[PDB]
Design a protein around this nucleic acid. Structure first.
Ligand SMILES: CN[C@@H]1[C@@H](O)[C@@H](O[C@@H]2[C@@H](O)[C@H](O[C@H]3O[C@H](CN)CC[C@H]3N)[C@@H](N)C[C@H]2N)OC[C@]1(C)O
Ligand SMILES: CN[C@@H]1[C@@H](O)[C@@H](O[C@@H]2[C@@H](O)[C@H](O[C@H]3O[C@H](CN)CC[C@H]3N)[C@@H](N)C[C@H]2N)OC[C@]1(C)O
Ligand SMILES: [Mg+2]
Ligand SMILES: [Mg+2]
Ligand SMILES: [Mg+2]
Ligand SMILES: [Mg+2]
Ligand SMILES: [Mg+2]
Ligand SMILES: [Mg+2]
Ligand SMILES: [Mg+2]
Ligand SMILES: [Mg+2]
Ligand SMILES: [Mg+2]
Ligand SMILES: [Mg+2]
Ligand SMILES: [Mg+2]
Ligand SMILES: [Mg+2]
Ligand SMILES: [Mg+2]
Ligand SMILES: [Mg+2]
Ligand SMILES: [Mg+2]
Ligand SMILES: [Mg+2]
Ligand SMILES: [Mg+2]
Ligand SMILES: [Mg+2]
Ligand SMILES: [Mg+2]
Ligand SMILES: [Mg+2]
Ligand SMILES: [Mg+2]
Ligand SMILES: [Mg+2]
Ligand SMILES: [Mg+2]
Ligand SMILES: [Mg+2]
Ligand SMILES: [Mg+2]
Ligand SMILES: [Mg+2]
Ligand SMILES: [Mg+2]
Ligand SMILES: [Mg+2]
Ligand SMILES: [Mg+2]
Ligand SMILES: [Mg+2]
Ligand SMILES: [Mg+2]
Ligand SMILES: [Mg+2]
Ligand SMILES: [Mg+2]
Ligand SMILES: [Mg+2]
Ligand SMILES: [Mg+2]
Ligand SMILES: [Mg+2]
Ligand SMILES: [Mg+2]
Ligand SMILES: [Mg+2]
Ligand SMILES: [Mg+2]
Ligand SMILES: [Mg+2]
Ligand SMILES: [Mg+2]
Ligand SMILES: [Mg+2]
Ligand SMILES: [Mg+2]
Ligand SMILES: [Mg+2]
Ligand SMILES: [Mg+2]
Ligand SMILES: [Mg+2]
Ligand SMILES: [Mg+2]
Ligand SMILES: [Mg+2]
Ligand SMILES: [Mg+2]
Ligand SMILES: [Mg+2]
Ligand SMILES: [Mg+2]
Ligand SMILES: [Mg+2]
Ligand SMILES: [Mg+2]
Ligand SMILES: [Mg+2]
Ligand SMILES: [Mg+2]
Ligand SMILES: [Mg+2]
Ligand SMILES: [Mg+2]
Ligand SMILES: [Mg+2]
Ligand SMILES: [Mg+2]
Ligand SMILES: [Mg+2]
Lengths: 193, 58, 51, 148, 99, 203
RNA sequence: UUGACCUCAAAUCAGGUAGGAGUACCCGCUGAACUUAAGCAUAUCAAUAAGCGGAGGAAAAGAAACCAACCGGGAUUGCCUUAGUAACGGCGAGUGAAGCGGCAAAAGCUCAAAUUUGAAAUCUGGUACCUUCGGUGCCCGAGUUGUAAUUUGGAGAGGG
RNA sequence: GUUCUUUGUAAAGUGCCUUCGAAGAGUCGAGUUGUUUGGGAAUGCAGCUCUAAGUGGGUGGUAAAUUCCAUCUAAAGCUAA
RNA sequence: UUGACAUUGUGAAGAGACAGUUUC
């Protein structure tokens, strides 16, 4: 059961795996079934946009922190800074997430602007009569995209203080390495002179 | 909450109440609040004067 | 769960159609294919947009 | 497709190609990795030497991408600049106007030294660098700025 | 908290202009709240000590806050619960029969 | 409010008093039928915070369960098969003693729905529970907007499916890395990772 | 002498409700051995078959005692990925997830704990009338061992 | 779409100062046993024993003492796709 | 079958240690 020169494979079918096969024959069938059921929301939903307005957000970890994408909802802090109540901003087709927090002015600023730009681009039909027939827009996020803030300019002055950028990386690492031990050498130091 | 605010004056506590815990902290609470309390025989007698079937406090 | 559909490279697909289009000129292939075109004005046949 | 298969050519041939003496039977070896240190040993040593035993530290709940640090050398590094604005900067090597190459924006975690950029000065914004990498940069008049 | 703008090291992180948002009212989920302070201490003088609680105090009174904590650490789950449960007796025993 | 007092008073169980109550009460509970109809909650402080309300159409039932382990009910302890599964006597039973209590009164008043239950008492042989049931067909409930969700058919016998609290515990329904197996539900989460997905154009 | 209260019963009392069927999919319980390891006990088959309880058109799950360690993210479920990876394993045979990311669908919430205390403001039933998925007057009864309003942590309440 | 009635001395949202802010227990947690998990000085579950607190509590995937930080609010509830 | 904890309450006499809360 072991022969020639081949990778070892771990091919995992030792249970009754033929029971748990799932084939998508409905790939096409469900694309249609969900395209109708989208365009049949676009009707039943009236001129409303079909989605909710989403915040700018900095992506987590170290891999994706470089980027930004739409978050869940708008942080009561921003809903108030854009000047409306949360409970109302729900019914304006703004999504408000009460869990998110603002540690970033630059993101908080970005998100309030994005909020006013929406209040300006929308028309709120009044409670009773009128309805100046409005021709629904199919997205919000397409109307109101997200692009990555520019971190720099094109070209700029070479400014060299000769600190090698590497030497910096080493020391910054060492400083963290012997840190608690240099505090132990400021404590074993503290009690005897 | 009337004893805790001392706005109560004469407080009554029945000797029934099979779930005794309901009424037991009262002699303590009243004493702690300097509110005269008394333990009256029957929780139904408390009810008649208060137009209930029972009360256990008046 | 027999493999039914077959994947093709997009560019390979397009290469194929591209070569197939270029043969709608090149009368002999159109003739060799069936298609009684020995009397038609020219290959390719282009027709008024009114059609 | 079955018409090119050799089991078609073996129709009529009695042993199917499997031999009269040796047959074809269920599992002469055992199943899979059976016999790894016993009868199939001569294979697993060579072929896969090292397949057995233990080697190093265990890491509980390791997540990749703590470790995400995609690499780019000075091998390219200019390929980060779009080809059009690139040629403008090659000629006109200068301080005070220097291309700013943000490597983390390009998807790179550390810049290595595979070596030979042009003598153009380049402002390289990076997370980490090789020493030799960043040396070749300054040797041509650029600088490196650390970012996060 | 003043990051350093570099990739590695001690305070490292992206420089950004911080904000420091509102406090949340589920942070304070454990706090004092005068009526609880009252109702709890009101129940203590209704109820008193339970057989493991008295035993604990005769240990501090004899064998000190050490053998106390250890036998408490056995009685409750952890060392930290034993800590402040012993301390709870320190402040019982001081006020009660010592003051 | 007197409720808060009752809450912090029941929290001292080995307090010199509640032991008197626990002792006298446990004698009485053991003197009635294993399943008997509680006239009132003996913890109106706790019951009400589990959703008991004083009104018509809430029932409290008291029910006794034997304590301890689950003996594999094999004749003469005879397992038949490999020695891991040979164990008769150290065997645990994944569902809570309160889970069995809710079920047995749920099987008692079926017309009801089972809201929740709480521990009142135990000794050695028996652990004593009080179950709060909500009558789904009684109009004070049906017309009650907070509690009428119970009258829906998908809430039939929720205690036998582990949808009460003691079920959502033993079923291990909870968020976060400790729950990966039982979170979205165990056999569900299992079947998926053991499903082989095959697309039309094969991935 | 009478009339309550609590507890417990009885009626072919008034009216409701549960059972059984089906069980592809779903929520749980219980639960193997064949088999693989070229023997075999841990292991594997498999948290599978069989047995048992409970549902719906979906079930379940769900508005974090979450994930993270970032410049942070933000209910649940699902697809593509993560990944045959971290890890578990006579570290043998074998096994084996999660976080980020793209995508589908999107949706939020409400109780307990608060004195209405210048007014139990709440509720089932009965009866009569009626504009009958219900409305109204009246009467029994529920209910202060607490039914309304109010508040649910994102808060929120009393004041000015 | 219209149209009738006007529910009101009813209900609701917003700024400021001040005072507060009740938040679930034989539970959480621990020992142990069994079982389960990829979860490894122990992933969940359950059984018996012990059984908390309130500037507390859970988590932070190597047991422990200590000092910090981060993150959420358990032990009650509903909800379409 | 043996032991420990739990079911597990109230006395008395003889001991066990910093007068009596506690243990054989
Ligand atoms: C059971 N869930 C699985 C999930 O585990 C995962 O499965 C991957 C599978 O997609 C990978 O395969 C994929 O990635 C390969 C390159 N890395 C190329 C082929 C591609 N299908 C397998 N190599 C490993 C499985 N664990 O992706 C598919 C899925 C259905 O979501
Ligand atoms: C059997 N011999 C094959 C040889 O025919 C060829 O096989 C590839 C095979 O690897 C691919 O297989 C795989 O390709 C993707 C890999 N991530 C998706 C998953 C799977 N379909 C086939 N789709 C096409 C064959 N020509 O290349 C690999 C090989 C082993 O040499
Ligand atoms: Mg292997
Ligand atoms: Mg089947
Ligand atoms: Mg959508
Ligand atoms: Mg430098
Ligand atoms: Mg280190
Ligand atoms: Mg060191
Ligand atoms: Mg083939
Ligand atoms: Mg042929
Ligand atoms: Mg041949
Ligand atoms: Mg031949
Ligand atoms: Mg022949
Ligand atoms: Mg051959
Ligand atoms: Mg032959
Ligand atoms: Mg031979
Ligand atoms: Mg052979
Ligand atoms: Mg050998
Ligand atoms: Mg590594
Ligand atoms: Mg490396
Ligand atoms: Mg950048
Ligand atoms: Mg990129
Ligand atoms: Mg902050
Ligand atoms: Mg506070
Ligand atoms: Mg009643
Ligand atoms: Mg038993
Ligand atoms: Mg068996
Ligand atoms: Mg076993
Ligand atoms: Mg939960
Ligand atoms: Mg698992
Ligand atoms: Mg599936
Ligand atoms: Mg998956
Ligand atoms: Mg598979
Ligand atoms: Mg009869
Ligand atoms: Mg009848
Ligand atoms: Mg049935
Ligand atoms: Mg088989
Ligand atoms: Mg075998
Ligand atoms: Mg064999
Ligand atoms: Mg054999
Ligand atoms: Mg079955
Ligand atoms: Mg559906
Ligand atoms: Mg549901
Ligand atoms: Mg999430
Ligand atoms: Mg998901
Ligand atoms: Mg899909
Ligand atoms: Mg795979
Ligand atoms: Mg071996
Ligand atoms: Mg497995
Ligand atoms: Mg109320
Ligand atoms: Mg909440
Ligand atoms: Mg209001
Ligand atoms: Mg408000
Ligand atoms: Mg809570
Ligand atoms: Mg130990
Ligand atoms: Mg033990
Ligand atoms: Mg089992
Ligand atoms: Mg804290
Ligand atoms: Mg904390
Ligand atoms: Mg956060
Ligand atoms: Mg919840
Ligand atoms: Mg639910």
């Amino acid at each position: 059961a072991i022969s020639k020169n081949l990778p070892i494979l771990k091919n995992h079918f030792r249970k009754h795996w033929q029971e748990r096969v799932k084939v998508h024959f409905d790939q096409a069938g469900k694309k249609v079934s969900r395209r109708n059921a989208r365009a049949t929301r676009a009707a039943k939903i009236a001129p409303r946009p079909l989605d909710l307005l989403r915040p700018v957000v900095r992506a987590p970890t170290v891999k994706y922190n470089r980027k930004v994408r739409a978050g869940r909802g708008f942080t009561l802090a921003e809903v108030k800074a854009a000047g409306l109540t949360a409970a109302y901003a729900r019914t304006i087709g703004i999504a408000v997430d009460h869990r998110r927090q603002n540690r970033n002015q630059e993101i908080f600023d970005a998100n309030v602007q994005r909020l006013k730009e929406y209040q300006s681009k929308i028309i709120v039909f009044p409670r009773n009569g009128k309805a100046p027939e409005a021709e629904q827009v199919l997205s919000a996020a397409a109307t109101f995209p997200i692009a990555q803030p520019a971190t720099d300019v094109e070209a700029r002055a070479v400014q060299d203080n000769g600190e090698s950028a590497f030497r910096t990386l080493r020391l910054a690492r060492s400083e963290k390495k012997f840190r608690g031990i240099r505090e132990k050498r400021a404590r074993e130091k503290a009690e005897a002179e | 909450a009337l004893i805790e605010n001392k706005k109560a004056k004469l407080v009554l506590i029945a000797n029934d109440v099979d779930p005794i815990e309901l009424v037991v902290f009262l002699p303590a609470l009243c004493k702690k609040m300097g509110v005269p309390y008394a333990i009256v025989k029957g929780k139904a007698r408390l009810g008649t004067l208060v137009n209930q079937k029972t009360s256990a406090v008046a | 769960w027999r493999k039914w559909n077959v994947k093709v490279n997009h560019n390979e697909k397009r290469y194929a159609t591209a070569s197939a289009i270029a043969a709608t000129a090149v009368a002999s292939l159109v003739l060799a294919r069936g298609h009684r075109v020995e009397k038609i004005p020219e290959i390719p046949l282009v027709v008024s947009t009114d059609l | 497709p079955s018409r090119f298969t050799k089991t078609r050519k073996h129709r009529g041939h009695v042993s199917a190609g499997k031999g009269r003496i040796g047959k074809h039977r269920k599992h002469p070896g055992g199943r899979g990795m059976a016999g790894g240190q016993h009868h199939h040993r001569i294979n697993m040593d060579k072929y896969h030497p090292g397949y057995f035993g233990k080697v190093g530290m265990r890491y509980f709940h390791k997540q990749q991408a703590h470790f995400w640090k995609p690499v780019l050398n000075l091998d390219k590094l200019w390929t980060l600049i779009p080809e059009d604005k690139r040629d403008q900067y090659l000629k006109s090597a200068s301080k005070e106007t220097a291309p700013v190459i943000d490597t983390l924006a390009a998807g790179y975690g550390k810049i290595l030294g595979k070596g030979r950029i042009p003598n153009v000065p380049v402002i390289v914004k990076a997370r980490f660098v090789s020493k030799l990498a960043e040396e070749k940069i300054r040797a041509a008049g650029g600088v490196v700025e650390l970012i996060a | 908290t003043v990051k350093t703008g570099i990739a590695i090291g001690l305070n490292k992180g992206k420089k950004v202009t911080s904000m420091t948002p509102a406090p949340k009212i589920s942070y304070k989920k454990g706090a004092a709240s005068n009526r609880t302070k009252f109702v709890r201490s009101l129940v203590r003088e209704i109820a008193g000590l339970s057989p493991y609680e008295r035993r604990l105090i005769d240990l501090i009174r004899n064998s000190g806050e050490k053998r106390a904590r250890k036998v408490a650490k056995k009685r409750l789950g952890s060392f930290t619960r034993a800590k402040a449960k012993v301390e709870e007796m320190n402040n019982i025993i001081a006020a009660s029969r010592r003051h | 409010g007197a409720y808060k007092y009752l809450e912090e008073l029941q929290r001292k169980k080995q307090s010199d008093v509640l032991r008197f109550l626990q002792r006298v009460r446990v004698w009485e509970y053991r003197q009635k039928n294993v399943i008997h109809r509680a006239a009132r909650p003996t913890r109106p402080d706790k019951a009400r915070r589990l959703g008991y309300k004083a009104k018509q159409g809430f029932v409290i039932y008291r029910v006794r369960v034997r304590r301890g382990n689950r003996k594999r009910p094999v004749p003469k302890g005879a397992t038949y098969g490999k020695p891991t599964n040979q164990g008769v006597n150290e065997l645990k039973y994944q569902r809570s003693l309160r889970a069995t209590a809710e079920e047995r009164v749920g099987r008692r008043a079926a017309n009801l729905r089972v809201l929740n239950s709480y521990w009142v008492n135990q000794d050695s042989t028996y652990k004593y529970f009080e179950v709060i049931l909500v009558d789904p067909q009684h109009k004070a409930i049906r017309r009650d907007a907070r509690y009428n969700w119970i009258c829906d058919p998908v809430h039939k016998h929720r205690e036998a499916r582990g949808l009460t609290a003691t079920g959502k515990k033993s079923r291990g329904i909870n968020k976060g890395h400790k729950f990966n197996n039982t979170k979205a539900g165990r056999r569900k989460t299992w079947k998926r990772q053991n499903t082989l997905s095959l697309w039309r154009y094969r991935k």
